Write a protein that binds this ligand. Structure first.
Ligand SMILES: CCCCCCCCO[C@@H]1O[C@H](CO)[C@@H](O)[C@H](O)[C@H]1O
Ligand SMILES: CCCCCCCCO[C@@H]1O[C@H](CO)[C@@H](O)[C@H](O)[C@H]1O
Lengths: 48, 149
């Protein structure tokens, strides 16, 4: 019913590792760029 | 430029304005001022400079005469080396849409007097140059940035 059975799982394995690796790296990258806004501070200084 | 300094060297001495703070001016003491002069205005940290039609010998003579006070200890002849100021890649944006035009200042950390690279850097700046709306050269100025401007 499904001759690809084995290949399909061998792929699923590779897909997972790369998936973990990439999701990780991209998470850092995203955080790294957003750091500029995440830590940003601001104040209201009217001529009051 | 004060904001540039305030952020480029945030958390250090160079981050302060020369005129100081409002609070300081309101509360500085006859003492503090005296203390500043005593602590800072000292012989090894000073230079008497003269340019024009004057005799060096004649000049140095007058110096010895009114620049008296000699030092006893070793601390009085020591020129203190200041704690280094840390540069920080950052930004400060003071927004007020009610002002007529915007001012932007961007910069990287320079080497400091001693370094020979300063020569090149000034040559560099010479290439980019400067510009303002009353430069007659106009669209023909040699500075690419002035041209586009
Ligand atoms: C080429 O690649 C191979 O293809 C086979 C299927 O054609 C898989 O079973 C093997 O695991 C795979 O390495
Ligand atoms: C999130 C994106 C994940 C992409 C994972 C790519 C891994 C697929 O890799 C595949 O593995 C099979 C089994 O060894 C081989 O037969 C295929 O030729 C190969 O392309």
């Amino acid at each position: 019913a499904e001759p690809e059975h084995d290949q399909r799982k061998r792929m699923g394995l590779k897909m997972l590792l790369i998936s973990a690796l990439l999701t990780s790296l991209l998470y850092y990258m995203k955080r790294h760029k957003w750091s500029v806004l995440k830590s940003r501070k601001m104040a209201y200084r009217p001529p009051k | 430029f004060d904001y540039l300094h305030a952020t480029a060297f945030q958390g250090t001495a160079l981050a302060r304005t020369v005129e100081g703070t409002t609070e300081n001016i309101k509360h500085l003491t006859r003492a503090d001022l005296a203390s500043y002069i005593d602590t800072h205005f000292k012989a090894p940290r000073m230079v008497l400079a003269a340019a024009g039609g004057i005799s060096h010998k004649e000049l140095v003579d007058a110096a010895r005469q009114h620049f008296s006070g000699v030092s006893f200890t070793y601390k009085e002849d020591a020129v203190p080396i200041l704690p280094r100021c840390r540069f920080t890649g950052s930004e400060i944006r003071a927004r007020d849409d009610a002002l007529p035009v915007a001012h932007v200042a961007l910069a990287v950390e320079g080497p400091g007097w001693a370094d020979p690279d300063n020569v090149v850097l000034h040559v560099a700046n010479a290439i980019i140059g400067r510009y303002d709306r009353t430069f007659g050269g106009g669209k023909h100025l040699s500075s690419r940035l002035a041209a586009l401007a």
